[PDB]
Structure formats: structure tokens, C-alpha cells
Amino acid sequence: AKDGPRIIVKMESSAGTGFYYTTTKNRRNTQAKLELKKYDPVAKKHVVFREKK
Amino acid sequence: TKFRKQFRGRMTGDAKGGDYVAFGDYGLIAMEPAWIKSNQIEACRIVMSRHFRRGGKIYIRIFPDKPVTKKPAETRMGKGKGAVEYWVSVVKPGRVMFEVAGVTEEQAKEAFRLAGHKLPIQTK
Amino acid sequence: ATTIRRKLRTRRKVRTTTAASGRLRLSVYRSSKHIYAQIIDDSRGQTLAAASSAALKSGNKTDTAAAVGKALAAAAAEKGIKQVVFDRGSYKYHGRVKALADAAREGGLDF
């Protein structure tokens, strides 16, 4: 599914002790690298989620 | 001289139609969808105007329908191509109706000319 | 705008008393004259009695709604007296929706 900074985005969250990648994307309209969030993880409540690699 | 594009299509089928009207003078109707080769009706008025007059205008009640798609003949075992034929097809509609007098239907006399089938004139 | 605006809540209201029928209806009228109530149980019904003034008469809008919310919250509620009810909420929420419903459970009704 293509590759080479042009179209499409390849980002995918990160949450501590709440093991889950969120596994979805959007696009680089908003800032790069940094990517603040919130939202539910495994279950329980909402957990970390702050994005990184 | 009919549509200007708006895609090809059309199919077949014969019967009669619907386009007959009580004429004011001296009518004329088709009788089923006879034979007129488009490039026949492309010689319908001019043949009805050899020299009827310098000027002169009346009324008709039809218009070229057509396309047919004939295709070459190198080996007919395929799909199609395009029209390249053309035809009108009608019912028993009016198409002439003179308004003079002594002439009566002189131009509805050699109308039957380009007419392999039967097309009376009647009157109304 | 009323006989042109008022159309938002009508059939959209009756969709809990007709989608459950476990809650009552509710008239609700402006007029700013008298107050009344006059409710009917279940969307498949529309006939019941009520009352009138002959109580405390001094016209108002705010403090006059919460009144019948208990002053007459059983006087007419014969059948069952109380049995899971829901308010109408035709228009907005000036306070007549509050001081009425917030004075509804005052005397009776389980909302």
C-alpha cells in the first residue's frame, strides 16, 4: 500500500500498560511527531496514549 | 440532424403508434411503420418542393428516430460497432396537409414516390 | 412563531409512551391565564377529566406551574395515583418546565 512521503499516513498511537496500538490513521495535516490523544484502551477506563514510534 | 450525441442504443418492434390528429384541411397518414431510409426522408421535402413555389410552408407531425448499427462484412461473428444507417418509423400520423386549392395534393402525389409501402392521403 | 414554529415536538414526543407506553403524556399550555394540567395515560388514549380555579387566583407564569405540580398532582390522578410518568417539554425550558416537574415529585408521581 505505497511508500514515499507523498500521500497516505503511517501513524499508530501508544499507551502505557494499556496494550493497544489503536491501529488507525488520518493524515499529517496536524503536527508531526507529537500527537496528543486520550481515549479508551483495553477497557477499564482510558489509559495513557501519547504516541511515539 | 436529430439528436446531436446523447449516446447510442434503441431496439426493434412493430405495431402502430400514437400520433394522429384531426387535420384542418387535407391530411395524410402513414399506416404502420413502413419503409423510409432516413436518407430517403432526406429526400422527402425537396422532392415535395421541386417547384411547388418560390416560398410556402405547411406542417408535418414526425421526426427522425433512428440508429441501427450495420457493421462491415469481413466476418460477421461479433458484437457491434455503430449506427451508420438511420430510420424514422411511424404509425398513422399526419405529415402534410395542404392549404391551397387546385393543387390539392400534387406534393402528396410524389410523396408516395419514396414509399415502397402504402401511404394514403385521406382528408379532414 | 408558534402556529408555524411549534411543530418540532409533537410526534417525536409520543415515542416513549408509544414506544414503551410506560410513561404518561402532558398537555402544557401557554395562555399565561390559569394553569391546569390534564394528562392521559398511554399514547393510545386521550380522555380524562380535570378541574379548574376555585383555589388561589392571582395570575403568573413562574410560580403558578410548580403549584399544580403538587397542588393537583393526584386530585385528577385517580387511576393508579402514580405510575411512572414523563413530562412533555413542548417548547424551551424557561422554568415552568422546572418549577412544575421539580414540584411534580413534590406531592406525587414517579419520574
Binding site: - | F23, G24, G55, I58, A101, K124 | -
Partner: protein
């Protein structure tokens, strides 16, 4: 010019000389018939012009008119048309024709006989009758005159249809 007949079926309606016939007078339906000799005295000179009688087999006497014209599609064997009879309190269909007659003062610049091919007019008539008296086709065909449909020599009263502004005879040589 008599009546009788009856047949509730299209049997004697498709057998040499005859017709089909229709009637719906006040408490008088049924589908008669009658032959077809001098049965083309409609659009000739009797187009609502005058109203005789008929002497039907048994009772009454209804004058009536012609109820437009129709002849036959393509051929000339008038398949069943219609027939109005003044005895109703609301149908439509009026027969107020507009002809073409004369020497055609078209040889002024260029133009032939008054054409017209239609078979429909802006008309109306209240009750049900359709008198016979109107022209419209003539009036110095040139420019700064014209003569169509919109008011003219109009039957009796005013007109009612939808939008009074058809086309009909006109000029344009």
C-alpha cells in the same frame, strides 16, 4: 336517425357497417350502436350547428349536438368516437375548430396557404353545446396585426382552461 339496438359487447361493434356508440345521460347509460350510411354528417355542416332529435326505441327525446369530430386514425373507418347529450348538471372537450379559407394574401413577400395541423383549441363552453360561428385565420397577414387565440370572436361569454395563450392559425408566411 332512429335508435334501438343494445349489445353490451364489442361483437356488433366490429362487424362491417356499424359503430359502438356511447350514452350516459341522466339515468341513461348503456352502449347502443346504429348503422353507418350518412354517418359522417358530423364535421360537414352540423358541427353543433343546430340540434335535431332522434326518437329512440321507447322513451324520451334528447336533442344533443355532435361532440367534436374524430373520424379514424390513419384509415377512414371511424372507430368509436363519442357523443354528448345535454343532460348532466362536468366533462370537457369542446369543438371550436379554426379553419383556413381564401386566396391567401401571402404573395406579398413569401408565404403559402394558411397551414395549421393541430386538432385542439383554447375554448371552455359552460353547459355543453358548442355553437357554430367563428373565423380567425384572416385579418391582413403581414405585421402589426396578427390573429390567433386569446380572445377573438369567442362562442358566448369568456374562456376557462389553464393558460389562455395557445397558437393555432397565426400568420408567419
Amino acid at each position: 336517425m332512429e335508435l334501438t339496438a343494445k349489445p353490451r359487447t364489442p361483437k356488433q361493434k366490429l362487424d362491417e357497417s356499424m359503430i359502438a356508440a356511447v350514452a350516459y345521460n341522466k339515468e341513461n347509460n348503456v352502449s347502443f350502436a346504429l348503422d353507418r350510411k350518412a354517418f359522417d354528417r358530423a364535421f360537414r355542416q352540423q358541427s353543433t350547428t343546430g340540434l335535431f332529435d332522434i326518437t329512440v326505441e321507447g322513451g324520451e327525446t334528447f336533442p344533443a349536438l355532435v361532440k367534436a369530430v374524430q373520424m379514424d386514425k390513419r384509415k377512414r373507418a371511424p372507430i368509436h368516437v363519442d357523443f354528448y347529450m345535454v343532460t348532466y348538471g362536468e366533462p370537457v372537450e369542446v369543438s371550436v375548430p379554426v379553419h383556413t379559407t381564401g386566396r391567401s394574401q401571402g404573395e406579398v413577400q413569401g408565404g403559402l396557404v394558411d397551414i395549421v395541423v393541430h386538432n385542439l383549441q383554447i375554448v371552455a363552453p359552460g353547459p355543453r353545446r358548442i355553437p357554430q360561428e367563428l373565423v380567425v385565420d384572416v385579418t391582413k397577414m403581414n405585421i402589426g396585426d396578427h390573429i390567433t387565440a386569446g380572445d377573438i370572436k369567442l362562442p358566448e361569454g369568456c374562456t376557462l382552461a389553464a393558460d389562455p395563450e395557445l397558437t393555432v392559425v397565426s400568420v408567419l408566411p
